[PDB]
PDB file of C-alpha atoms and ligand atoms in Angstrom:
ATOM      1  CA  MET A   1       1.509  11.161  14.218  1.00 17.40           C
ATOM      2  CA  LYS A   2       3.431   9.579  11.338  1.00 17.15           C
ATOM      3  CA  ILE A   3       5.788  10.835   8.690  1.00 20.21           C
ATOM      4  CA  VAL A   4       6.158   8.771   5.509  1.00 14.77           C
ATOM      5  CA  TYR A   5       8.850   9.667   2.993  1.00 12.38           C
ATOM      6  CA  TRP A   6      11.079   8.502   0.136  1.00 15.63           C
ATOM      7  CA  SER A   7      14.667   9.741  -0.158  1.00 12.90           C
ATOM      8  CA  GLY A   8      17.299   8.803  -2.744  1.00 12.44           C
ATOM      9  CA  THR A   9      20.409  10.403  -1.225  1.00  8.80           C
ATOM     10  CA  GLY A  10      19.109  11.415   2.197  1.00  8.06           C
ATOM     11  CA  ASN A  11      17.969  15.016   1.701  1.00  8.17           C
ATOM     12  CA  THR A  12      14.268  14.395   2.249  1.00  7.41           C
ATOM     13  CA  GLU A  13      15.090  11.850   4.965  1.00  3.80           C
ATOM     14  CA  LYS A  14      16.955  14.616   6.833  1.00  4.32           C
ATOM     15  CA  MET A  15      13.953  16.908   6.412  1.00  6.00           C
ATOM     16  CA  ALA A  16      11.699  14.168   7.845  1.00  3.51           C
ATOM     17  CA  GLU A  17      13.949  13.872  10.915  1.00  4.96           C
ATOM     18  CA  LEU A  18      13.858  17.629  11.518  1.00  5.21           C
ATOM     19  CA  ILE A  19      10.082  17.864  11.083  1.00  4.82           C
ATOM     20  CA  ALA A  20       9.780  15.009  13.591  1.00  6.20           C
ATOM     21  CA  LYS A  21      12.023  16.921  15.971  1.00  5.83           C
ATOM     22  CA  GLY A  22       9.690  19.948  15.877  1.00  5.57           C
ATOM     23  CA  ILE A  23       6.596  17.835  16.594  1.00  6.12           C
ATOM     24  CA  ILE A  24       8.373  16.133  19.493  1.00  4.02           C
ATOM     25  CA  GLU A  25       9.586  19.498  20.811  1.00  6.56           C
ATOM     26  CA  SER A  26       5.947  20.607  20.850  1.00  5.80           C
ATOM     27  CA  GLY A  27       5.243  17.739  23.237  1.00  3.30           C
ATOM     28  CA  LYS A  28       3.842  15.168  20.820  1.00  4.46           C
ATOM     29  CA  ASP A  29       4.985  11.719  19.662  1.00  7.24           C
ATOM     30  CA  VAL A  30       5.802  10.984  16.024  1.00  6.36           C
ATOM     31  CA  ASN A  31       7.290   8.098  14.037  1.00  6.82           C
ATOM     32  CA  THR A  32       9.164   8.516  10.751  1.00  2.00           C
ATOM     33  CA  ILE A  33       8.672   5.673   8.273  1.00  4.38           C
ATOM     34  CA  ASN A  34      10.368   5.130   4.925  1.00  2.99           C
ATOM     35  CA  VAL A  35       7.720   4.421   2.268  1.00  4.98           C
ATOM     36  CA  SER A  36       9.031   0.876   1.772  1.00  4.71           C
ATOM     37  CA  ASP A  37       8.220  -0.020   5.411  1.00  3.17           C
ATOM     38  CA  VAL A  38       4.763   1.612   5.667  1.00  5.47           C
ATOM     39  CA  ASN A  39       1.603  -0.340   6.569  1.00  3.83           C
ATOM     40  CA  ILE A  40      -1.329   1.259   4.740  1.00  2.00           C
ATOM     41  CA  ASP A  41      -4.039   0.106   7.155  1.00  2.00           C
ATOM     42  CA  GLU A  42      -2.190   1.606  10.123  1.00  2.00           C
ATOM     43  CA  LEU A  43      -1.460   4.829   8.264  1.00  2.00           C
ATOM     44  CA  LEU A  44      -5.149   5.347   7.468  1.00  2.00           C
ATOM     45  CA  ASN A  45      -6.067   5.715  11.167  1.00  2.00           C
ATOM     46  CA  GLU A  46      -3.968   8.849  11.499  1.00  3.29           C
ATOM     47  CA  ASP A  47      -5.449  12.294  11.927  1.00  2.00           C
ATOM     48  CA  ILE A  48      -2.781  13.978   9.796  1.00  2.00           C
ATOM     49  CA  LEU A  49      -0.648  12.369   7.107  1.00  2.00           C
ATOM     50  CA  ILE A  50       2.792  14.002   6.656  1.00  2.58           C
ATOM     51  CA  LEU A  51       4.246  12.907   3.298  1.00  2.27           C
ATOM     52  CA  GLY A  52       7.550  13.683   1.657  1.00  2.00           C
ATOM     53  CA  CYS A  53       9.320  12.911  -1.600  1.00  2.00           C
ATOM     54  CA  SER A  54      12.090  14.563  -3.615  1.00  2.00           C
ATOM     55  CA  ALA A  55      11.647  15.808  -7.174  1.00  2.00           C
ATOM     56  CA  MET A  56      12.368  13.127  -9.786  1.00  2.00           C
ATOM     57  CA  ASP A  57      12.253  13.620 -13.540  1.00  2.00           C
ATOM     58  CA  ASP A  58      10.716  15.438 -14.796  1.00  2.00           C
ATOM     59  CA  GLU A  59       9.211  17.270 -11.838  1.00  2.00           C
ATOM     60  CA  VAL A  60       7.314  14.118 -10.805  1.00  2.00           C
ATOM     61  CA  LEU A  61       7.077  11.957  -7.668  1.00  2.00           C
ATOM     62  CA  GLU A  62       9.502   9.040  -7.413  1.00  2.00           C
ATOM     63  CA  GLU A  63       8.045   6.330  -9.649  1.00  2.00           C
ATOM     64  CA  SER A  64       9.023   2.915  -8.268  1.00  2.00           C
ATOM     65  CA  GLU A  65       7.971   3.292  -4.645  1.00  2.00           C
ATOM     66  CA  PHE A  66       6.422   6.621  -3.706  1.00  2.00           C
ATOM     67  CA  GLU A  67       3.916   7.118  -6.523  1.00  2.00           C
ATOM     68  CA  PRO A  68       2.436   3.563  -6.262  1.00  7.62           C
ATOM     69  CA  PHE A  69       1.987   4.228  -2.523  1.00  7.40           C
ATOM     70  CA  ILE A  70       0.123   7.475  -3.288  1.00  4.41           C
ATOM     71  CA  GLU A  71      -2.004   5.684  -5.890  1.00  8.44           C
ATOM     72  CA  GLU A  72      -2.868   2.934  -3.440  1.00 10.13           C
ATOM     73  CA  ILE A  73      -4.078   5.271  -0.655  1.00  7.83           C
ATOM     74  CA  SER A  74      -5.715   7.812  -3.009  1.00  7.63           C
ATOM     75  CA  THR A  75      -9.215   6.291  -2.708  1.00  8.24           C
ATOM     76  CA  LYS A  76      -9.092   5.966   1.091  1.00 11.15           C
ATOM     77  CA  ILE A  77      -8.005   9.458   2.162  1.00 10.78           C
ATOM     78  CA  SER A  78     -10.900  11.767   1.272  1.00 12.74           C
ATOM     79  CA  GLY A  79     -11.421  14.370   4.007  1.00 10.23           C
ATOM     80  CA  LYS A  80      -8.013  13.665   5.591  1.00 11.61           C
ATOM     81  CA  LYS A  81      -5.477  16.308   6.559  1.00  9.83           C
ATOM     82  CA  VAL A  82      -2.082  16.058   4.864  1.00 10.35           C
ATOM     83  CA  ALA A  83       1.127  18.109   5.076  1.00  9.27           C
ATOM     84  CA  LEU A  84       3.611  17.855   2.197  1.00  6.03           C
ATOM     85  CA  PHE A  85       7.384  18.352   1.997  1.00 10.05           C
ATOM     86  CA  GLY A  86      10.398  17.433  -0.097  1.00 12.45           C
ATOM     87  CA  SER A  87      13.852  18.399  -1.337  1.00 11.08           C
ATOM     88  CA  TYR A  88      14.546  19.399  -4.938  1.00 11.10           C
ATOM     89  CA  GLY A  89      17.531  20.363  -7.032  1.00  9.61           C
ATOM     90  CA  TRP A  90      17.373  22.559 -10.097  1.00  8.13           C
ATOM     91  CA  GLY A  91      13.645  23.152 -10.516  1.00  6.71           C
ATOM     92  CA  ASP A  92      11.320  25.714  -8.975  1.00  6.85           C
ATOM     93  CA  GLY A  93       8.960  23.415  -7.119  1.00  6.60           C
ATOM     94  CA  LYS A  94       6.754  22.272  -9.999  1.00  5.29           C
ATOM     95  CA  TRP A  95       6.628  18.691  -8.668  1.00  4.42           C
ATOM     96  CA  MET A  96       5.308  19.986  -5.346  1.00  2.47           C
ATOM     97  CA  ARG A  97       2.648  22.242  -6.878  1.00  2.51           C
ATOM     98  CA  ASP A  98       1.449  19.168  -8.740  1.00  2.08           C
ATOM     99  CA  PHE A  99       1.659  16.961  -5.625  1.00  4.56           C
ATOM    100  CA  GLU A 100      -0.515  19.479  -3.739  1.00  2.00           C
ATOM    101  CA  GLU A 101      -3.028  19.715  -6.607  1.00  5.20           C
ATOM    102  CA  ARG A 102      -3.202  15.910  -6.718  1.00  3.78           C
ATOM    103  CA  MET A 103      -3.906  15.484  -3.000  1.00  2.56           C
ATOM    104  CA  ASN A 104      -6.578  18.172  -3.094  1.00  2.00           C
ATOM    105  CA  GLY A 105      -8.059  16.359  -6.077  1.00  3.37           C
ATOM    106  CA  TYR A 106      -8.398  13.233  -3.928  1.00  2.00           C
ATOM    107  CA  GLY A 107     -10.412  15.214  -1.377  1.00  2.00           C
ATOM    108  CA  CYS A 108      -7.565  15.828   1.071  1.00  2.00           C
ATOM    109  CA  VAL A 109      -7.227  19.011   3.024  1.00  2.00           C
ATOM    110  CA  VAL A 110      -3.654  20.309   2.617  1.00  2.93           C
ATOM    111  CA  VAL A 111      -3.164  21.915   6.041  1.00  7.02           C
ATOM    112  CA  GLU A 112      -0.055  24.005   5.472  1.00  6.07           C
ATOM    113  CA  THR A 113       1.957  25.434   2.602  1.00  7.51           C
ATOM    114  CA  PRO A 114       4.163  22.545   1.387  1.00 11.38           C
ATOM    115  CA  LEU A 115       7.745  22.798   2.653  1.00  9.04           C
ATOM    116  CA  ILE A 116      10.376  22.550  -0.092  1.00  6.58           C
ATOM    117  CA  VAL A 117      14.145  22.880   0.378  1.00  4.49           C
ATOM    118  CA  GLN A 118      16.903  22.831  -2.200  1.00  2.31           C
ATOM    119  CA  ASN A 119      19.325  19.939  -1.724  1.00  3.35           C
ATOM    120  CA  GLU A 120      20.320  19.161   1.890  1.00  4.27           C
ATOM    121  CA  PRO A 121      18.526  21.154   4.631  1.00  2.00           C
ATOM    122  CA  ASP A 122      21.541  22.508   6.544  1.00  2.00           C
ATOM    123  CA  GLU A 123      20.756  26.250   6.336  1.00  2.00           C
ATOM    124  CA  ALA A 124      17.031  25.455   6.318  1.00  2.00           C
ATOM    125  CA  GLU A 125      17.193  23.266   9.439  1.00  2.00           C
ATOM    126  CA  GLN A 126      15.118  25.548  11.665  1.00  2.00           C
ATOM    127  CA  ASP A 127      12.584  25.914   8.844  1.00  2.00           C
ATOM    128  CA  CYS A 128      12.063  22.148   8.907  1.00  2.00           C
ATOM    129  CA  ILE A 129      11.714  22.143  12.708  1.00  2.00           C
ATOM    130  CA  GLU A 130       9.214  25.053  12.558  1.00  2.00           C
ATOM    131  CA  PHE A 131       7.183  23.246   9.902  1.00  2.00           C
ATOM    132  CA  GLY A 132       6.876  20.375  12.351  1.00  2.09           C
ATOM    133  CA  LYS A 133       5.783  22.807  15.064  1.00  3.85           C
ATOM    134  CA  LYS A 134       3.105  24.224  12.756  1.00  2.40           C
ATOM    135  CA  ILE A 135       1.677  20.744  12.158  1.00  2.00           C
ATOM    136  CA  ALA A 136       1.653  19.987  15.887  1.00  2.00           C
ATOM    137  CA  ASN A 137      -0.447  23.176  16.325  1.00  2.00           C
ATOM    138  CA  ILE A 138      -3.226  21.756  14.075  1.00  2.00           C
TER     139      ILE A 138
HETATM  140  C1  LIG B   1      17.065  10.988 -11.621  1.00  2.00           C
HETATM  141  C2  LIG B   1      16.828  12.297 -10.905  1.00  2.00           C
HETATM  142  C3  LIG B   1      15.981  13.235 -11.440  1.00  2.00           C
HETATM  143  C4  LIG B   1      15.806  14.506 -10.818  1.00  2.00           C
HETATM  144  N1  LIG B   1      14.865  15.384 -11.336  1.00  2.00           N
HETATM  145  C5  LIG B   1      14.709  16.548 -10.742  1.00  2.00           C
HETATM  146  C6  LIG B   1      13.714  17.509 -11.260  1.00  2.00           C
HETATM  147  O1  LIG B   1      12.983  17.279 -12.207  1.00  2.00           O
HETATM  148  N2  LIG B   1      13.655  18.687 -10.585  1.00  2.00           N
HETATM  149  C7  LIG B   1      14.492  19.058  -9.514  1.00  2.00           C
HETATM  150  O2  LIG B   1      14.413  20.168  -9.023  1.00  2.00           O
HETATM  151  N3  LIG B   1      15.376  18.181  -9.027  1.00  2.00           N
HETATM  152  C8  LIG B   1      15.500  16.988  -9.578  1.00  2.00           C
HETATM  153  N4  LIG B   1      16.391  16.071  -9.057  1.00  2.00           N
HETATM  154  C9  LIG B   1      17.243  16.445  -7.929  1.00  2.00           C
HETATM  155  C10 LIG B   1      16.710  15.906  -6.602  1.00  2.00           C
HETATM  156  O3  LIG B   1      15.332  16.243  -6.431  1.00  2.00           O
HETATM  157  C11 LIG B   1      17.510  16.516  -5.466  1.00  2.00           C
HETATM  158  O4  LIG B   1      18.883  16.162  -5.622  1.00  2.00           O
HETATM  159  C12 LIG B   1      17.065  16.231  -4.030  1.00  2.00           C
HETATM  160  O5  LIG B   1      17.921  16.925  -3.118  1.00  2.00           O
HETATM  161  C13 LIG B   1      17.132  14.731  -3.741  1.00  2.00           C
HETATM  162  O6  LIG B   1      16.647  14.485  -2.446  1.00  2.00           O
HETATM  163  P1  LIG B   1      16.620  13.042  -1.828  1.00  2.00           P
HETATM  164  O7  LIG B   1      18.060  12.725  -1.348  1.00  2.00           O
HETATM  165  O8  LIG B   1      15.739  13.156  -0.669  1.00  2.00           O
HETATM  166  O9  LIG B   1      16.238  12.126  -2.903  1.00  2.00           O
HETATM  167  C14 LIG B   1      16.542  14.802  -9.615  1.00  2.00           C
HETATM  168  C15 LIG B   1      17.404  13.823  -9.075  1.00  2.00           C
HETATM  169  C16 LIG B   1      17.527  12.587  -9.686  1.00  2.00           C
HETATM  170  C17 LIG B   1      18.432  11.571  -9.037  1.00  2.00           C
END
């Protein structure tokens, strides 16, 4: 499987690493890829797309790299399974509710409840690992 993410200070990156750890612990292989290094064509062959991005202002996806990526793949992912995650700061998850609505709008099947964590995982570490285990059970 593959995990694609954008992280500005490392919070979401840390989540990505933990989610990957859960998938691997379940006996499966997974590669984490920063959005700047992703190859679209290779990503489109995946069964499940695991995507992550922190909340930028105001309650939107990161604009310079992550959103353009989402826009680019939007017309090629109908029927695909996706799992969403991200770290946020002061909000209540509005950016994620919108991210989930958007992916469903493109015809994607959002397989699990999106995982959101405030700031760095730390206390939510096991939660991240378990989220990965849930995805490996799909
Ligand atoms: C310019 C900017 C705008 C932000 N806007 C929001 C926001 O609208 N809602 C929110 O909850 N957090 C907001 N945050 C906080 C980040 O989502 C939060 O610090 C998160 O932990 C960053 O994770 P990352 O290191 O993976 O980027 C913003 C951060 C930055 C730098």
